[PDB]
């Protein structure tokens, strides 16, 4: 069923590219800026894809694109799926299960978030240390293939200390700053109320988003070491907290995309 | 994308046993449906009748659509409502509230029953809801967006709004009435909460906790409207002494809230709309 | 509401096997099925050969229905139980509680394996779960509800038995056991918890955590039965220093538990009420 339905996804890659990438990436909403750093070789369709979903959500490009970025061979997500559009979470992380097929070793993932931390300033890229699940879903619910990996896998490091480190590393040498803190998933598409912000900061969040965090899940049961990135596009202080619109984000996000621009190119041979 | 015709469905017919262009909706909760008798009724239109409605299945909701006048203010009302506990999505649970936006209402006024966390309150209490705190597993704007019912992501900085609350206050306090303002939490049921639940409600911030109510209000934010909501306190719900609790006595202290609501809607309404 | 007729199916097919009359149904949970050599058996049932039962997909849950005399109490043991994680809705979860209810059986005696939360716990500490806290993302009594099963709102007061929990404290200082209580959480697995999601459920005020149990104690509570439950420690989940955890080491861990639940269970059945 499962991995049936991978290796036909990979089968037909591999007749598109002949590329053996060692970073996979998924690119969030107004992040997709960041293609354009990649030498393209191939941007495949998702269509052309045997099992793969639609990015219906506005700035998510929706396509495969294979090349290398630094003279590291890479696959990068332009877009991705979201549990509130109606994809399930076995459809939004099957691309994950592709690129740990490809033979990736590390997941790079990048969103938009609200920053719950009042440390926090607007357009921040924080660096993701450890997060939350609060979706409804699990992708991992269902028979587990011990071929794909482990009954419960263990999450004590899902995002890779060395990884941060390096981040880190090139954050201080570019001279920026990247603060260290939780992610937490939430369902969406609402934003979130004044009083449910005031409880996912005292349940331990610094941003609040609505994704990554089922592909970081599927990403650690099959074995890929992961590197997150949040960009903060919103301030979320109850006590001043301002209606939010998605045109304003786009904008914010950008200005944290072109920091995400200058990091990863440097990133990117230090870790692999 | 095949709702939008689901409520003009819903709403044609509608049109076809009613003239009226209401101002205001309005949802009545359990042990509530008695505030129907407010309204002078040009008809009460049974769930059954109308194109794509659910039923309710719950003790005293009545199941039925009151569309009428209050004070002289054209008006729809849910007498009776659905919920996710019954197995219904809350596709169907909000359903209703896409009607009335079509049908013309501005304003949606919601009630409903809840337990009283906050230990400040006092049983048949009726809370002005401030703001929510959603901790039911679905949400009912999933799936695909209509940009022409809503945006994608709504924005949820004052849900309630703040002009209808300030003239609820105002209103109690020349009849004499305490109305306190707090947090709902809205949980699945239909169980009620442990001990160990209510002290986490209670630290995540909520005042009263009900099986309904977010969802209706998702949706309407979503579509526009402006949203007054009650909450009557019916059971008190301190862990350190936490009594049985039993349907029968939720009706009864509802029915002292209700009228406490009889009291003040009619009173509200005409200085909202 | 087709739900008793799968009841019946079942049960008769269980008295076609097993005449007995059970005054206790147990479940045994991830590495605790040797518990059941405490039960002199008459029969041994595969789910399998049962209208309705699931299969168990995890390793240790042996997936039989054990029944038989425990020190003197006729008993209904699911050696191995059934998880929301392996894809099985709660309805299936929870249907052989349903199961032991039209048995006859008055209480229900639930283990499993949980992770330690509170610091003041031990490996391989046997707890005595005194509540709990369900973040569970699904409801087995959500829909309609049968008023022969049990009420609509089920109270929450005291789902784990005041008197039981007593004996089972006596129990444990006769035998010179430590049994703290505490409060477990149930979250849907099947990754364990990150650090962060550690710190947070004891800020909510959980003492152990685990992937099972609610569901069941859920609808025991809707069914008029009686609940005991006990959480074996089988890992600590301290998150300034938190060691990775392999289902081996676990399994290992709970058979130390379960040698102290086989001395205390059979000691504990016949002094309930
Ligand atoms: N405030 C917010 N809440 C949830 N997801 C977000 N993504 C960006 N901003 C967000
Ligand atoms: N204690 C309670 N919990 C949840 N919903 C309720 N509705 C009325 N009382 C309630
Ligand atoms: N750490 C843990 N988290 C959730 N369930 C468990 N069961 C045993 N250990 C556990
Ligand atoms: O490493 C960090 O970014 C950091 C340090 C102190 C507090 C929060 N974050
Ligand atoms: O009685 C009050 O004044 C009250 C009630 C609820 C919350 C805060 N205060
Ligand atoms: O009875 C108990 O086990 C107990 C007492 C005090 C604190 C925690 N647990």
């Not at 495949?44 to 929706?62: L, R």
């Not at 619910?141 to 060395?162: A, I, K």
């Not at 939010?244 to 944290?256: P, S, T």
Request: hydrophobic share 45%.
């Amino acid at each position: 069923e499962l991995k049936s339905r991978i290796d036909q996804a990979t089968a037909k890659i591999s007749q598109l590219w002949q590329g053996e990438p060692a970073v996979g990436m998924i690119l969030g909403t107004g992040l997709g800026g960041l293609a354009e750093q990649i030498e393209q070789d191939i941007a495949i369709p998702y269509s052309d894809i045997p099992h793969f979903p639609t990015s219906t959500v506005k700035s998510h490009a929706g396509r495969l694109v294979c090349g290398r970025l630094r003279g590291i061979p890479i696959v990068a997500m332009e877009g991705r799926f979201h549990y509130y559009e109606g994809y399930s979470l076995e459809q939004v992380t099957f691309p994950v299960r592709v690129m740990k097929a490809m033979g990736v070793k590390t997941l790079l993932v990048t969103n938009a978030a609200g920053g719950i931390n009042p440390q926090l300033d607007l357009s921040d890229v924080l660096i993701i240390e450890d997060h939350i699940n609060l979706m409804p879903e699990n992708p991992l619910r269902g028979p587990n293939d011990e071929e794909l990996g482990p009954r419960f896998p263990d999450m004590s490091h899902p995002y890779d200390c060395q990884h941060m480190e390096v981040a880190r590393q090139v954050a201080l040498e570019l001279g920026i700053h990247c603060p260290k803190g939780v992610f937490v998933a939430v369902s969406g598409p609402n934003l979130e109320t004044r009083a449910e912000y005031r409880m996912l900061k005292l349940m331990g969040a610094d941003v609040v988003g609505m994704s990554t965090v089922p592909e970081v899940l599927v990403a650690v049961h099959a074995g890929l070491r992961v590197l997150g990135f949040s960009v903060v596009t919103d301030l979320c202080l109850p006590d001043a907290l301002e209606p939010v619109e998605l045109n304003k984000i786009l904008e914010v996000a950008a200005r944290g995309g072109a920091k995400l621009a200058r990091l990863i190119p440097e990133i990117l041979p230090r870790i692999a």
